[PDB]
């Protein structure tokens, strides 16, 4: 069961490090009154579906 | 022990020739009031981490 628990404490860590790298790469694009650079729309799932 | 001493007088010489080539390649960038050309930030470990 410890191996059944070392999975969930090692599959959340690799999911935590994508949400952080998703955040830090497009946080200035949400602060300005500007666009999203639609290449990064394709690669990163951005919250501006097209809005804000 | 002489072979144990010919290492340290031949591993410092190859480390001395990197500190000299690190010095001579970016010594004008420290004299002017200017930037560092961030490609050479990647290759050479420059003392302007971004300052001066």
């Amino acid at each position: 069961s410890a191996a059944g628990l070392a999975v969930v404490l090692s599959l959340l860590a690799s999911c935590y490090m994508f949400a952080t790298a998703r955040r830090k790469c497009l946080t200035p694009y949400a602060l300005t009154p500007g666009a999203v650079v639609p290449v990064t729309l394709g690669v990163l799932c951005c919250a501006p579906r097209a809005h804000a | 022990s002489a072979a144990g001493l010919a290492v340290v007088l031949s591993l410092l010489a190859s480390c001395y020739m990197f500190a000299t080539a690190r010095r001579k390649c970016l010594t004008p960038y420290a004299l002017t009031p200017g930037a560092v050309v961030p490609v050479t930030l990647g290759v050479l470990c420059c003392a302007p981490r971004a300052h001066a």
């Binding site: 999975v7 090692s10 599959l11 490090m17 994508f18 830090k24 | -």
Partner: peptide, 29 residues
């Protein structure tokens, strides 16, 4: 067991392989 701990053992070092590269770029700019 090596197949299980080699998949998400190899997923995790790729998740660090992004975040080392992203903080190398968008600290610089």
């Amino acid at each position: 067991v090596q197949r299980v701990a080699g998949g998400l053992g190899g997923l995790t070092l790729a998740a660090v392989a992004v975040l080392i590269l992203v903080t190398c770029v968008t600290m610089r700019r």
